[PDB]
């Protein structure tokens, strides 16, 4: 075992090849599948795994009732192999958690699991399953983190957490973690900005995070930083607005776009010089559909012109959260860090007549070979037996 | 860990010893068993696995409704250990797929998973579960592949894909794949021939495939080739016709036999000089029964005389797809490549009064020791609870 | 990895410590557990496993109907870790089989699985899961074998099979198998004797088998042999009759005891010079209760006196088949071969009002430390939901 | 593999970080989850596992009826990975038992499983799953042991067993066990003391146990001993009484506190010089709530003054058994033995209107980083379908 180097560049990609689909909700109609949300993928040098926050309940059982609720003591972070349904019979226990991150440094898994009360939550860090550190809410208002993989470069792993309001200015901190021990943190000077649920990736020994502005931005904030936590901040300039909700595409801004700026959805994007691969919902108002857009000047330019669009979920089908993951050269044998993404397909409440809320997933990896647009939706027929 | 050599000849065999049976449909009446079709077996130097295309649904659940349908975004290629029922709790996720192939080169698994729309399908190629290449539809008309194992020789693996009409001339391509990367492909010049769902095996460093003529052939087409994809083509001459449907046995042809030629079923045969071991259904009109027939001049001769018949499934019992798989010397310690086969036992629609279609399997290995004819059918009592 | 020597003597034992209980039937009331009979235990140098003949059906499902039936094409030999319920989700497929044996030579697993028609059945032998030999019925009348572990000495494994009538003189053969290849077999000269379902163990480089006389013996036949298949034969002389059914205990015989001699139950016994540890039912007429008796002159003396009895299952509780297994010094680190046994607890037909027949198990290992008699019965409440 | 040294001292801790939660009862409403009680956690140098005593029945199935009952032949000691639900599909079978202990010496697991009748129970000792010894009841009155992990130092493992009345003076023995073989045992001279369900841990090469006085003590008894089983005895002096039931806090005693002394619950405490970390229920009269309390002079001082209290389960929520477990330097890489604990969250009879009694778990590890009080209760909604 050796540390992931994390020093090559992102592989340039022309399209996205489908990687996994788990059909969890479809299968949970009969089988024993966890009620989950906030799924994400992360890879070691040997395998890729789906992480997810369970609700301590299975689909189509009565304890699935009320799972629209975000935070409870029943929620646990757990993981299974990519593409498998998250079942009590195939899933490894990670942490007690209603917000979470994980990532593999090349040697062992780091996991971060926040539980406790809204006014004094605690992140428990584990390295190879052993508790190695904790960090407690500093603003006493729902300490929260990525809901996707943390990022590793040369034995140090990096994440972002937020504490404070979700409808106004909050506090955002960046952490450096080595063998599960926080060795440095910095609070971001980001007035008039808002970061949550950061999708962070390594690229040439530095970390880039694209996040959710729930306060007043329908474009996505970003923060990048080096191993010493010296950071830079911005918003994606493209007029192809990345958040949900959002306005129709028009002239963008390098600051937060206030039109339709309140609320949000967890998302991601990949920076390639001045350009950007944007993943987003197809609907401007609800979590429906998904598409990947290549905008060759979208990182720094404000026009709404793009070069490529690839359909992933159709506009009438349910989507939800999305995030980045990467495959490092140590895993693939390439000479670059490969970009991939997952989409959470949220089913049930609040949009459907169920007592429950849960998600299945799909993921894709970046390639330079031929690809195609389509729709790979969840496909469960709601309501279920328990609802009726 | 070492590449499969694939340079020895096929073991001569006098009969077929039963190797597995999963009883998947019988078990899925209560257990959590995927609805599947298109199963196949493939071996590494250490184990044999069953690969299959799920419908993203479990048996006796309402999501099994309409699983007569061949292609959807829910279908996934998964695998389990030979003879186990395909459950979400024992199945390894491979790829998102409504048509597939897989094989092991002696170092890692290659998997091939075709998904997307009928007019622009994409094969995703994975080596050790990492995406390593893609190939897209070149006739825009249901890109499709073997539904059985690809074949490997000295580090290269080979498969066949079809694109175009299923009731006429189509286009047929052969591929050389090393470590999941397509290193060469050739389009077959095969006018008035039709190939699909090819069953391919290695034999003396070369590949022989026996396929399905869905256009106008009630005997089976074949294609053989070397590692440079220089090929030869033909049809099995035996008057013991291999496809289903087909006419009653009579004088054969070394080109397509047009009588009952349209439509077909995936199948296989093994070439031994001028002779041929034929697997086929017992009914001439539907997928019922299965039998193995040794015809010592059937590869190249057109008479309907044969020397050995061994019963596998009784004529009143449902059958379906069948395909070759091999066990290499590296696995067996023999000095030859051992032929084996599997049979898909299809239950439900169109022939039975259910909302669903699914399959169990049985598999047999060639030996020169004493064997017996019998019937090992699926054994499920239809309809199921969900149908009623 | 080294061959089991098999050259030490049986360990002297004063009593039996409980080793495992799986509660299969109790648990299959709700969970997915196989309908099984003919369970047995066998150990490698690293673990012990339960082997069993499934009925290709789960408990409390409709396909359990009619499982009183002994032979069908749906029956499969499968194995799981000792003490775990036999489920499709924890069980490894071994062979298609309605009669069976298995044993580990120190290097790999040998398995023997008989399937096919009553008038021409075939035993398929596998070594590390690969077919290595077959042997076909020689009397065309239900080729059958041990339903317990075969016995291994220095790289050779030994079993017994019977072919012929179950109500009269039949034919009995002994086999020597190396790496799953039959290297020698002999037919026993045993007129007026009858051997089936032999429980065979190694002891000082020779094999001793205690078996079932279904023709005309209420005491148990035995056969012992050396590695060259030179054999000796006899019946257990003790007046503590070991078969079920049997008479009440009285003066025994060194030939078959005809009183209550027809029919039988698979059983075992362990020889210690002139003495014998007999495992048997508590009832003289049905498969109910179980007890272990030490009779210090019972191998060769005909009195009905014994020195020790240890209760295992109470007289009013269901028992069934039993058999020996051993733990070799390569596994335990002892300087002798440890004797152990399992009991099948048969539930359902013909004695209970169900559509099905199945069994759970218990096992014990011989020790010299303190032990106790009790009852560890099956404990399922019959009938089940599917019966009603 | 190397023996756990066990020679470092206990890590000083300032609070408890949440480590796991299995949600077993919530999940067993639909999933296949064992009815259990008496779980506990123990770790090897590679993993932590949950051990528990099943009732040989699954939740929401009719065989869970009457599971208030402590001792039966159906009860088995099994284990799974920490935080996973105890299911037949993820659980290792360990031993047949209605009382148990287990621990890992750095090389293999020792398991201890007591079954048989109340007047002659036998402890079966296993090392790496092989029977290596037994010990039988020496007072004929429910031989019983820890229900928590044994303690290991330099290849010796230690435990405590009780035999005799649970409402008066009984007999208490300590055992030294090497590779599953009892090498020494001592009967405790403890007149007017009562010990059972001991929680024992290593600390500087010596064992400290904190136990349950069921006779006449509402504080907890303790016994500490060296590797030769030379022991010292006493009761925790703190006026913060540790048992349940108990009186309200007031001046303590260094011998048994008779007020509310009869009856009790399994529990634990960690000694740090003259101080003590106490885990206890929040209710004085029933098994409800749980809290950790640091009393810097509570080992040897009788006042009811304490420094730190940390909430674990809220006072209106069901609690139950609790026990210590440790993580050795060999697992953690620390220079001290880390204390952890678990709490059994009992549901059903006698306090709720069900046919069954079962338990889920939560566990916590000691840290010197920031922590928080909260409530992590069982969370199931009773009654269940089977009760109605
Ligand atoms: C899904 O979940 C909802 C919401 O329920 C809440 O969360 C769930 C998970 C549980 O934790 C509940 O306890 C929570 O309430 C369910 O709605 C609840 O249904 C239950 C069952 O009917 C209701 O509980 C009953 O209420 C009865 C009415 O009592 C009230 O008035 C009487 C005077 O008549 C008075 O005595 C009492 O104090 C109440 O004020 C009561 O008689 C009975 O014993 C029982 O308590 C509960 O009120 C409902 N909650 C809400 C918020 O409406 C759904 O039933 C559930 N659906 C499914 C399909 O499972
Ligand atoms: C049982 O068999 C083993 C062989 O595996 C015998 O052990 C060997 O004996 C020879 C001397 O004849 C030595 O050269 C070897 O070193 C021994 N090998 C091992 C691994 O110990 C043993 O003598 C036989 N025991 C009995 C009881 O007959
Ligand atoms: C805490 C505020 C935050 C942003 C509105 O809510 C998140 C939004 C969510 C959402 O918009 O779907 C669901 C997340 N599970 C939740 N996070 C937490 C920690 O509860
Ligand atoms: C698409 C043409 C082809 C031949 C008619 O269809 C096959 C027929 C099938 C059949 O005869 O059973 C099943 C195959 N799953 C299907 N293949 C695809 C890719 O859908
Ligand atoms: C074949 C004769 C034999 C002895 C009567 O029947 C056995 C009796 C059985 C029994 O007495 O319970 C069950 C065995 N499964 C069966 N063996 C086979 C091969 O069917
Ligand atoms: C046997 C006396 C002892 C103390 C009353 O009983 C314990 C009480 C129990 C309890 O208070 O919950 C549960 C334990 N399973 C039980 N132990 C046994 C061996 O049955
Ligand atoms: C990246 O790191 C590797 C491994 O330490 C090193 O050998 C290589 O020189 C580095 N490459 C670049 C481009 O910095
Ligand atoms: C990577 O980390 C190691 C250990 O701290 C350090 O020695 C090395 O200089 C780092 N490498 C680079 C290229 O920064
Ligand atoms: C086949 O290949 C192996 C491995 O490369 C080689 O050693 C052997 O000589 C070859 N066999 C034949 C029949 O050519
Ligand atoms: C099957 O599909 C048809 C068509 O939509 C529908 O009418 C019927 O209700 C379905 N049956 C089940 C069991 O879902
Ligand atoms: C097998 O492939 C390797 C790599 O191309 C090559 O070195 C070797 O010559 C090949 N052997 C044969 C028989 O073609
Ligand atoms: C069991 O099988 C018989 C066939 O003999 C059938 O008549 C009966 O209805 C079946 N019973 C159940 C409960 O399915
Ligand atoms: C054990 O088997 C080996 C291999 O056949 C043989 O050489 C040896 O003589 C055997 N030993 C005994 C004691 O039979
Ligand atoms: C603890 O044991 C280790 C391993 O044997 C030893 O090296 C060390 O000296 C010991 N420490 C103490 C404090 O006794
Ligand atoms: C349930 O358990 C009780 C013990 O409390 C037992 O005596 C009774 O017979 C059982 N009742 C049913 C309906 O199974
Ligand atoms: C640990 O055990 C070994 C083996 O008995 C012994 O020789 C050694 O002295 C022991 N170490 C200590 C510190 O007791
Ligand atoms: Ca927003
Ligand atoms: Ca642009
Ligand atoms: Ca045809
Ligand atoms: Ca011919
Ligand atoms: Ca008899
Ligand atoms: Ca006698
Ligand atoms: Ca007490
Ligand atoms: Ca105090």
Residue numbers in the entry:
A (entry chain A), B (entry chain D), C (entry chain C), D (entry chain B): 82 to 469
Please, what does the article write about this entry?
NA is a homotetrameric transmembrane glycoprotein responsible for cleavage of sialic acid from the host cell membrane. By blocking NA enzymatic activity, neuraminidase inhibitors (NAIs) prevent new viral particles from being released from the surface of an infected cell, thus stopping the spread of virus in the airways. In this study, we applied a set of experimental techniques using recombinant NA variants to understand the molecular basis of development of oseltamivir resistance in the viral N1 neuraminidase NA2009. To decipher the structural mechanism of resistance, we determined crystal structures of NA2009 mutants in complex with oseltamivir carboxylate.
Three variants (H275Y, H275Y/I223V, and H275Y/S247N NA2009) crystallized in the monoclinic space group with four molecules in the asymmetric unit, representing the tetrameric biological unit. Crystal structures of enzymes containing the H275Y substitution either alone or in combination with other mutations show that the bulkier tyrosine side chain pushes the side chain of the neighboring E277 into the binding site, affecting the binding pose of oseltamivir. Specifically, the position of the pentyloxy substituent of oseltamivir changes relative to that in the wt enzyme; the shift in position of the terminal C atom (C91) is more than 2 Å. The crystal structure provides a direct explanation for the more than 1000-fold reduction in binding affinity for oseltamivir in variants containing the H275Y substitution. A similar effect on oseltamivir binding was previously observed for the H275Y substitution in H5N1 avian influenza neuraminidase. Compared to wt, the sensitivity of the H275Y single mutant to oseltamivir decreased considerably (more than 1000-fold increase in Ki). For the H275Y single mutant, the enthalpy change for oseltamivir binding was substantially affected and was 8.7 kcal mol−1 less favorable than the wt value. This change was only partially compensated by a more favorable entropic contribution of 6 kcal mol−1 (referenced to the wt value). The substantial decrease in strength of oseltamivir binding to the H275Y mutant is caused by a significant loss of binding enthalpy, which is partially compensated by a gain in binding entropy. However, we did not confirm the loss of a hydrogen bond between R152 and the oseltamivir acetyl group, which was proposed by Le and co-workers based on molecular dynamics simulations as an additive molecular mechanism conferring drug resistance in H5N1 and H1N1 strains bearing H275Y mutations.
